[PDB]
Every structure is written in C-alpha cells, then in structure tokens.
C-alpha cells in the first residue's frame, strides 16, 4: 500500500477590508433599456453577499452555467460585470452559451466559454409601463452577426434594394424602429422580464472580491490545509527567504507548480512543499518458515 | 514531458482538479473529470510504453 499523512488544521486568509457593497442598487433600479443600453456596471471592491439573492422566493430559478449556484458563496473573484437588459419573459431561452435565435444573432451575444450566471426572473408592474408601452423597443435585423459582449449603439438604415429609405418609408421601404402600441390590459404572459447577466473573471489577477468567510490565524511546521485566496494545497508552511518584489504575489517553480506564497493580510513570505508520503514495502521470509514481518516506508 | 502533461486542459474547463471540484457539485464535475482522467491515463500509458 501507500503511505501519506493527513492534515490536522485548516486555515483561510483573504484581505481584511470588507466594505459591504450594494448588489441591489442594480436590482432596485429606476429605469431599464431594451437592447441598446445596459450600463456595463463593475460591481467589485467588496464582499460578494450572494445570500441576498436566494433568500427571496419571489424569483425564478438560478438557471445558469459554469458554477453550481449554491457554490457561488465560496468562490473568490476578480471582476464582476452585471448586464441589465429587459426582454420578453416567455421568450427567455436565447440567453445561453452558443445558441441561435434572432436576438441571439444580431444583438447581445454570450460567448461559448461563458463562465458566469444568467439569472433572470419575473416582472409584473415595474417593467410594464402604465397607460401604454411605447418606450421599450429593440432594433430589428442588422447587417450581420455581432461579436460577443459588443455594444451596438451605431444605428443606420439598412439598404438592400433600390431604395436607400432616407425618410421615404413605404412602397417597399421599411424602418426597423416602430411603435408597439401595447395597451395595459393585454396578455401579461407576453410582458418582458428582468434579465441580468453576472459574468465572472477567473482568468488574470489574484482574487479580490468574495464572501463573508472568517479568517483564522497562521500555523507553521505542520502538514496543513490552507486557502490563501484561491491558492489551495496540502503541505508545510515555513517562512522562506524569497525576496518578492512588491507587485509579486504567488510563486512558481521549474515544472510550473506552486512553490511560495505571501499572506494577503500580513505580507509575510511563505513556501509550500508536499508533506511526506511514499510507499510501504513488506519484508518477510517465506510463510512456510515463520510468520514474522518487517516493514519499510519508502 | 510526463510532468508537463498535467497542466494541459483536454477539453474540460480547467486543469486543476480541486477547482473543478470547487465549482460544480453533483454530475457536471464528473462529466469534466471524465475527460481529465482519460487524458491523464493515456499520457501515463504512453510514458510506460517508451
């Protein structure tokens, strides 16, 4: 068999500052735009209090891809982008990684490597206008498809026939923008819903924003478990004489393995080496002679 | 080369195994871990053969 020690204690460290941030400021908003404006907010520099979303039962399901929704409270991010656009709530299927659809081919595009949430839910009176709905309008067919996460502010009349349609609408000439004329007492099932996209960036920088988890103290000279802001591992932490330059956070070795770490609160240098393991070998004479054994830990 | 093959992706969404287990609980961790295991196993077999 194989031999390997188990950790005894566990340590979690991430920077001291918390600064509870207003997730709901984009949820309890004033007005929304259809497809042209979504304000590309950058909620960050805080602690992600995702508990504010699943405590209320008046929402749709956390139907999104990349991370298990219940696990969203134990991930540590770098930058979060919230997309605020509102579209029909019975047509809310085109917002998925790599799916077709007209709004999914000449409007907002999600990438095929979308590692973020697309949480969306109902809208009853806040979105639906009082005494007629004429403002929430979306642009019609475009020249071609658009690149993911790209704005489409530029507007111009499409020309494919003999008419440039420069204010001469009619007689085989069209203008994409038109008034819907939605009176209130209509098919509320057709009412647009609140659609938000919370993209995640697990790519570039050491983690900066994450939940209210509690930070313990430091343990030394012990095969230990640790979570220094994403840098998970199993090993022994001794203070090493590696002279970090200020901007440097992690440490890596010849074969691209994590080797040295600094504390996100105390700035102390530390390193990482696997705690002892190996194989176990049994030494014995033939069982026909005696039943004694000697054992070796490789 | 055998060591360097560990950092590769093989079609999953990440190479480090704990992070996969740190984002995805019930079946989808397993659908990714299938690809990870297949790739690593083939690399090991090749190494043993040479």
């Amino acid at each position: 068999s194989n031999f390997r020690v188990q950790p005894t204690e566990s340590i979690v460290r991430f920077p001291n500052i918390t600064n509870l941030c207003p997730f709901g400021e984009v949820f309890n908003a004033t007005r929304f735009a259809s497809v042209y404006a979504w304000n590309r907010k950058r909620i960050s520099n805080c602690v992600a209090d995702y508990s504010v979303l699943y405590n209320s039962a008046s929402f749709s399901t956390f139907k999104c891809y990349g991370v298990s929704p219940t696990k969203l409270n134990d991930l540590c991010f770098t930058n979060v982008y919230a997309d605020s656009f509102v579209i029909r709530g019975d047509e809310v299927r085109q917002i998925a990684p790599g799916q077709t659809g007209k709004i999914a081919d000449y409007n907002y595009k999600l990438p095929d490597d979308f590692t973020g949430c697309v949480i969306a839910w109902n809208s009853n009176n806040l979105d639906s206008k009082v005494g007629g709905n004429y403002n929430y309008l979306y642009r019609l067919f475009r020249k071609s498809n658009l690149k993911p996460f790209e704005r489409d502010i530029s507007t111009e009349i499409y020309q494919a026939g003999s008419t440039p349609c420069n204010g001469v609408e009619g007689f085989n000439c069209y203008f994409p923008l038109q008034s819907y004329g939605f009176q209130p007492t209509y098919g509320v099932g057709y009412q647009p819903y609140r659609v938000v996209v919370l993209s995640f960036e697990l790519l570039h920088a050491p983690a900066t924003v994450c939940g209210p988890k509690k930070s313990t103290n430091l343990v030394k000279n012990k095969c230990v478990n640790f979570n220094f802001n994403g840098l998970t591992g199993t090993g022994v932490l001794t203070e090493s004489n590696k002279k970090f330059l200020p901007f440097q956070q992690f440490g890596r070795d010849i074969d691209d393995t994590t080797d040295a770490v600094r504390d996100p609160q105390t700035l102390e240098i530390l390193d990482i080496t696997p705690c002892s393991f190996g194989g176990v070998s049994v030494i014995t004479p033939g069982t026909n002679t005696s039943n004694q054994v000697a054992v070796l830990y490789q | 080369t055998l060591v360097k093959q560990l950092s590769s992706n093989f079609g999953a969404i990440s190479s480090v195994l704990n992070d996969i287990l740190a984002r995805l609980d019930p079946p989808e961790a397993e659908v990714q871990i299938d690809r990870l295991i297949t790739g690593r196993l083939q690399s090991l077999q090749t190494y043993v053969t040479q």
Partner: peptide, 24 residues
Amino acid sequence: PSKRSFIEDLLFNKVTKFNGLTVL
C-alpha cells in the same frame, strides 16, 4: 575521496519531486 582512481574520478566528474513521481 571515496576509493576510486584518477581515471574513475575524472569519469564521475565528467557527467552531470513528489507529485506522484518517485525515485528509487
């Protein structure tokens, strides 16, 4: 130093890990 000769000394001087891997 050990027990070797001049030639064997030249011969040794002339010739110059726990993520699963092990060395016996």
